[PDB]
Ligand binder design. Structure first.
Ligand SMILES: [Mg+2]
Ligand SMILES: [Mg+2]
Ligand SMILES: [Mg+2]
Ligand SMILES: [Mg+2]
Ligand SMILES: [Mg+2]
Ligand SMILES: [Mg+2]
Ligand SMILES: [Mg+2]
Ligand code: NA
Ligand code: NA
Ligand code: NA
Ligand code: NA
Ligand code: NA
Length: 260
């Protein structure tokens, strides 16, 4: 049948894997009113969206004898709703300077790759030093992404810090994917210590990214050059320190999700 009209509150339209425990509770309140259900206790599902998605339909029925089957099917319909394809490009400094920090860069990327696993996400991994290389071409195939992560872990840092070459490969793929028609995010991990005219080259390439519609983030490693990262990223609000650990990861995750 094609007579379903499920429109969630705007702030609940993100894929349920990103729902907080409070989001789950709000979804229940919305559903009770939308579907004229009997009262749903606010603690019926004391868990976040990742956990909600592990429950079976039987679990829903046990938790809500009056409404669990309907809520489960509602969730399935929400999961089937089309969401805009979102493309994340990681542009990673493998120069000699960040050699003793490669694992820190890799681990930040792995954490973000593990977060952005909803089916509308596609990831690409690029590394740069004296030359830039696409390690993982843009894809939503989680098997290829896992292989891309294994390849990233084996990188041996060496060479100059020619970040413009890495940004160029993100821009080339964004152009091939549709340019302004795409939803594209670049995440550059670097200390931002650029030599010669590389600052000019990098800022030019980043402005090209923005002319293609992309939003540019910079994650700083080591004693990174904050001002330089601010000129590459869209703004200081899109510059995060890799040293901020979970708080920096949460900050950048929320910022990216808020581009949807
Ligand atoms: Mg509504
Ligand atoms: Mg909104
Ligand atoms: Mg929340
Ligand atoms: Mg029953
Ligand atoms: Mg460097
Ligand atoms: Mg510099
Ligand atoms: Mg999160
Ligand atoms: Na319906
Ligand atoms: Na790969
Ligand atoms: Na793209
Ligand atoms: Na965008
Ligand atoms: Na600027």
């Amino acid at each position: 049948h094609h007579h379903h009209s499920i429109r969630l509150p705007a702030h609940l339209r993100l894929q349920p894997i990103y729902w907080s425990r409070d989001d789950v509770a709000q979804w229940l309140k919305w559903a009770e009113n939308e579907f004229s259900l009997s009262p749903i206790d606010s603690n019926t599902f004391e868990m976040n969206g990742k956990a909600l998605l592990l429950l079976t339909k039987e679990d829903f029925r046990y938790r809500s004898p009056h409404s669990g089957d309907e809520l489960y099917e509602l969730l399935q319909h929400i999961l089937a709703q089309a969401r805009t394809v979102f493309d994340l490009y990681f542009v990673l400094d493998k120069s000699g300077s960040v050699a003793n920090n490669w694992i820190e860069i890799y681990n930040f990327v792995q954490q973000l790759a593990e977060r952005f696993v909803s089916p509308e996400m596609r990831l690409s991994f690029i590394v740069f030093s004296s030359q830039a290389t696409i390690i993982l071409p843009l894809t939503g195939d989680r098997g290829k992404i896992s292989k891309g992560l294994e390849d990233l872990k084996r990188v041996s840092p060496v060479g100059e810090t020619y970040i413009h070459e890495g940004l160029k490969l993100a821009n080339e793929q964004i152009q091939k994917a549709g340019g302004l028609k795409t939803s594209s995010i670049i995440i550059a991990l670097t200390d931002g210590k650029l030599d010669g005219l590389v600052p000019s080259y990098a800022e030019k390439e980043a402005k090209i990214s923005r002319s293609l519609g992309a939003s540019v983030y910079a994650v700083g490693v080591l004693d990174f050059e904050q001002a330089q990262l601010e000129r590459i990223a869209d703004s200081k609000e899109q510059v995060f320190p890799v040293k901020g650990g979970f708080q920096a990861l949460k900050g950048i995750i929320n910022s990216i999700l808020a581009q949807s």
